[PDB]
Ligand binder design. Structure first.
Ligand code: 96Z
Ligand code: 96Z
Ligand code: CA
Lengths: 306, 306
């Protein structure tokens, strides 16, 4: 199906494709993703919002859950300062061309009936299971707090509370979402997107450890950031520059180079770019320059609307 | 930038890319291709019309030259019958969605001023050169006729007469088009498309040999013809089914396969299809069936309007 192909494109996994095919037959359907409000919104966020846009075009009503209370339980600061960031994040997400219901957790996460359901789920969730679900999400702490195990069941309940057919997130959301499928009466279809590699080649991209491209970065910031990113010749796996070409660039694409080096390169797909680089037919710096300029031409509509 | 990329896509050569860029700067610009009227219009023809549609979307005015007199000089029968076939070809080309100025050669090829220029060019064209330009075009004849060397002079003059900036044709047209660049006062930009391999892998796709997919073939004939086409596992060069996937199918596309043979296959681009087939991750059967069904869904709007 056309819709199914467009949804699956560039996903790490769908749990399950069979169930997703059933959701697509319905007349009304909805999908939700949530984010701990972040000071800088980077390509990691943009990749996921792109996936939410795909669902919108397939007839899904979209909810964005700004998990300000979740960020609080995960030691990201005080609530009023997280709300300020969440307002900015809502600004950015609309600039990406997503029109969705933007909901703040704290405005719904503390009502009488929501809280009781969290405690019902706490009866259903083992500590071991809750601990393991936060392995990739919990901010480091040498004395892990009780708030760390309340966080995942709150995320399970938002899925229940939102009534969505589809839950979207990064692969690090895998085990929390697997919990929601067991504990909630309705099984939710889970779409997980890949984790972007940081520009310095060490771990994922993230607001902390400045190894990211923000969607509102200036053309000068993007070039410099990409100029010095991790990118060994002939190396595709773990290469953040190739990931950006795979997930954000529009094809066909032209690499201009003098005839002394081969002449201009018309690249009709990402796979053709992968072949050129693997065969050392394209020097890393010419790769970086082209990707940076393309990215600038892709993030420009976002910059203007902000 | 994007216009040039769309024009160059799936061409064998452009003579020259530099000149083509100057053409794109003009407010008005025109392109011409001509066809000896053919009883069966097959994918070989469709490939070329697709390229004319690409030029149209880049701001080119399009001229289709139905070469009834050329087909006459090339031993295709009576002039009266050839013209009728050109009428049918004009319908087919319109059914392909090309809105163009359709011209019949004989309605222009016999005017006194046209003929006099034919003879001007005949002074400038050596016999050996005109004969060489027809190596791949002339119907086989062990007693070659004078009509064989008048044919290329008429095609050279049609370019001049049409006043086009761009001349389009198959790679077998390249010696004639290179002749026109030498003889005419203004160098014309030549865009050459590849020669499709016939379904039996034996040669070009020709109605004359019975190894083609007609754009009005029924789904049965398409399936039957493709089911028994040349398509060895792992062989891309010279494989007509891979060429059809390269030049006609829309990517990304999904190949349906049972889970005992891996499950559904998402193919982001032809280059990925190449890698999969080259490495024998996709069996010829699955390739052939997918190509036949996509092709059926591609030629179907053409089939109805006839
Ligand atoms: N785990 C997500 C943050 C989210 C949440 C946090 C707490 C509670 C409820 C719902 C949530 C939805 C998304 C991340 O890693 O940003
Ligand atoms: N040479 C092309 C057919 C064409 C022509 C043939 C004869 C005369 C004049 C103009 C032509 C324009 C295109 C082919 O090989 O089919
Ligand atoms: Ca602005």
């Amino acid at each position: 199906m056309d819709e199914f192909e467009m949804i699956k494109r560039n996903t790490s996994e769908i749990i399950s494709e069979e169930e997703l095919r059933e959701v697509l037959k319905k007349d009304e359907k909805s999908a939700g993703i949530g984010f701990e409000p972040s000071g800088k919104i980077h390509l990691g966020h943009y990749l996921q919002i792109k996936k939410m846009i795909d669902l919108q075009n397939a007839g899904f009503d979209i909810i964005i859950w700004l998990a300000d209370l979740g960020a609080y339980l995960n030691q990201k600061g005080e609530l009023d300062e997280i709300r300020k960031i969440g307002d900015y994040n809502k600004k950015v997400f609309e600039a990406m061309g997503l029109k969705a219901k933007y909901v703040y957790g704290s405005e719904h996460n503390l009502d009488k009936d929501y809280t009781l359901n969290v405690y019902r789920l706490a009866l259903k969730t083992t500590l071991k299971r809750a601990r393991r679900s936060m392995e990739l999400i919990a901010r480091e702490d040498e004395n892990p707090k009780v708030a760390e195990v309340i966080y995942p069941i709150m995320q399970v309940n938002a899925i229940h509370y939102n009534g969505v057919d589809v839950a979207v997130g990064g692969m690090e959301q895998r085990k929390i979402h697997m919990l929601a499928r067991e504990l909630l009466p309705k099984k939710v279809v889970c779409i997980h997107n890949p984790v972007l590699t940081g520009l310095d080649g060490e771990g994922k991209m993230s607001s902390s450890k400045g190894n990211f491209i923000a969607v509102d970065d200036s053309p000068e910031e993007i070039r410099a950031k990409i100029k010095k990113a991790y990118c060994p010749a002939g190396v595709v796996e773990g290469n953040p520059i190739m990931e950006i070409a795979k997930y954000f660039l529009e094809y066909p694409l032209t690499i201009k180079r003098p005839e002394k080096f081969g002449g201009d390169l018309t690249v009709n797909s990402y796979e053709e770019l992968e072949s050129l680089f693997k065969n050392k037919e394209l020097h890393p710096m010419r790769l970086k320059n082209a990707v940076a300029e393309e990215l600038i031409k892709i993030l420009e509509p976002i910059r203007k609307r902000l």
